Amino acid sequence: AKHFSGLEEAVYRNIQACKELAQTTRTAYGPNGMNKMVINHLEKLFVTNDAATILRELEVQHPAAKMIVMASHMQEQEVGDGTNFVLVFAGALLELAEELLRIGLSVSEVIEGYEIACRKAHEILPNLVCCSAKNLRDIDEVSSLLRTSIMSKQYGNEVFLAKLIAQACVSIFPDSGHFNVDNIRVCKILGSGISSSSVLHGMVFKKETEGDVTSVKDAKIAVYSCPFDGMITETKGTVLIKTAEELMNFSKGEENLMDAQVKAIADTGANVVVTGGKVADMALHYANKYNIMLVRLNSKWDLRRLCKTVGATALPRLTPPVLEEMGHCDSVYLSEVGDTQVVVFKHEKEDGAISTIVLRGSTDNLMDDIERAVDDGVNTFKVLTRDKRLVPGGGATEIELAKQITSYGETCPGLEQYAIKKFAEAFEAIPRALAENSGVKANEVISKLYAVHQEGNKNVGLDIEAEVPAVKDMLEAGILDTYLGKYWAIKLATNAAVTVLRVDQIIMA
Template sequence: MALRVPQAPGIGQMLKDGAKHYGGLEEAVYRNITACKELAQTTRSAYGPFGMNKMVINHIEKLFVTNDAATIIKELEVQHPAAKMLVLASQQMEQEIGDGTNFVLVFAGALLEYAEDLLRMGLSPTEVIEGYELACKKTLEILPDLSCGALKELKDEAEVTRAIKTSVMSKQYGNEDFFAGLIAKACIAVQTRSNTFNVDNVRTTKILGSGVLSSSAVQGMVFKKIVEGTLKKVDNAKIAVFSCPIEASHTETKGTVLIKSATELLNYSKGEENSLELQIKGIADAGITVVICGGKVGDMALHFLNKYKIMAVRLNSKWDLRRVGKVIGATALPRLTPPTSQEAGHCDHVFISEIGDTPCVIFKQDNDASCISTIVIRGSTDNLMDDIERAVDDGVNTFKALTKDGRFVPGGGATEIELAKRLASYGETIPGLSQYAIKQYSQAFEAIPRALAENVGVKATEVLSKLYAAHQEGQQNTGFDIEAEGAGVKDMLEAGVIDAYLTKYWGIKLATNAAVTVLRVDQIIMAKQAGGPKPPKQGGMDQDDD
């Protein structure tokens, strides 16, 4: 008599053994919300100028010490599928604006936290989603009214510094004025007349030593290299760029040369030397004073380059070759031939300079229309310089956002409290169960000033009550003053704490979309993983092994 194998009940009977299935509010929705809340809580304490740093060690054991949410979630490698949706929204924010990643995580986490309360009250996920979408639409309608000014002149260094200072402040509190000024100078130098701006045109070079206030901006490029020959400085340089090595040419196929006497050997060597000298003389006759190559410079070639007073710079990276070609307006040539006037580039100053004890080759342009600027970052540790680099990246991306839309809104939680106040009033005009979701959506905005206050070490409830009181009196630019003693509030426009309008717009939009996507999930079905049992983890070497 054959034994009957009992089938798993429900959906389990359709799937392979080992598949997992979770359904309903308790198993799927609440699980997802909990995972997202945990992720938001991780980055929430890193929000704002007084945000705490996280020490993250990634899968290749590289250490990161930062409060930049984009770096934290990138290196954490989040596996939970629902939390991954928040990570994707945050990464999209990084691509779209380059700043505000933590805002997306904190706000989306708060939305899901309040959604959980509504679901436990008895509302269905559909009703919550409907209310959230209505609230988001209304928020994006209100947001333009909260604009407190616009960047009128993109070439005005003082105005640009003021506009990007807040985004730099969150990473480099105390040095924000200095770095905002450097970034503004670098961005304005590379901005084209058509107001188009490419973030890749502002480069960074990190050189260990000195203090952060020794950092500087250079119009052109800086390489941690030394020149190959004896010439150390050339002004008004005409430059040739070669992607090939500079050395005696070799035959494409292997050949054998039979030499019978010493005279023949001398003549053979002489022929090679003459051929190379003719090539370098032709380059010198074309007026070239600096050559940049992507390969090695042979000893014989170096002798002739010194003879014809040509500076030689070797760059191993093809990206560096391409960028320096862009700065000087040169075309990289694949063979050692004299360049035409269109292929040769020009640079006002090429020279060796020691920054700290690091020798650097600097390509510097005097004119205002340089294609690329370099910010030389100094610092006492690599981790500190990495953090400054992320602050520079945020500042440059904020400038890019301002070239698209020059408006800005008050920071320090002022925009969020005003939106919360207006949405709460709007929620009361909506009939049905959606009004509960709209009211909870408005309360989720409180998470931003609350996080700022908690990270400073002030009672958040006291800050929120003062902010609401000020906004009820019509002071819509009033935000939390982190520099005041206790729970101080201040006009953010006077304090110079402003955020780019597009940062808030995309942050609210992406956070809402992420939260709604998580709430739409009512079942989690995980198929059995492919392959057999997983191999055991590799341990350390045994002591017997050599």
């Protein structure tokens, strides 16, 4: 770092971050998501509509922001819609908390008041348990619950994506009591429409498939990054291609060498060779005759997905597999995935933990936007598995916490009296984020929600009914939340907010 003086980090650094955070979740949160352009070190267009992703990609130069980054990342694992919340609740509380400081309120006196308010907020949340639904045998129930999560993360086809994520997540384990984070793995294959994406189960290798079939039930695999150019460690790993005379004997010789390799795996157990290494011209010929599958050209990502599920372990050497390097899948077969030929394995009773949604788009640009919707939606299913408490649609949750917190200023006083009040406004930052998206007055949005006085129903979503004002029931629309989502978000948000607010000058020479 660099040196600082006059307790600058508290007044100055805290508000710089607030803004940096702002408007990358103050318009890509709620019922319509919005694209932001991120260019990475290998430059390409990348559209983000998700809070956790855009921060991983950014290099945080502010030390004030970095705390807040970590808490968003916990929330990415845990909810995938409490991740959008960390930023907006946290930034807003510091802006308001700065105002209090000027009056003379001490930094910790306010921190007391935010903490009794948070415990209190959590007491209100069982009054914001409005209806309970949970069928994990029904695609129909699941899709409505995910629907507000994926909405925030996409501007596209909301309804169609909701059926694909629901179909994957239910179908894999409809009797599980807990679900996994890498239970669904993405496969990102080029071509076709967005609404031409589909659902398979088990591992898909998105890279080239060759050999020739020979089984559809015996799906034993052995995983290598070791090439078959002429690399074998049971004998010598040297090639002879630097001499013209030898190179010719070697081309002819590669045929027989390849037969030794293929058998060497298979006999001890394989039917499909997983090969991150490369398969020569002559090599490709011997496997076609012999009739063992090849899944050629596998990058590190492709091989790791495979290893983690089956417990097959890769080496850069080729020797017959021991049992720890052997995996098994319930099935394999060769059929097109989205209308492109690949290998599809099945897992849904072997160990599950890998389903595949094929993300399609004639360009990689269309795919990233749907990558965010599914990946966040994995972890939203993991909340609905654990509990059934159903929390109304976005932004309709937020009003009631604000109304009962205002009561909390009046009944408690102290020097915490002020802090509690700004805790109240700070939950209103979330529908003010929707007012800022809609581009109409903040104040008018807030006015309608208090006037009808409905608490757990009414909010201004993103519509053309949000342009000339109206209010709508987000309790009944297929836009629902869950209890734990909000319980986690708030807890880690208040964790993050308070602790940046403590900071004082960096002392260095």
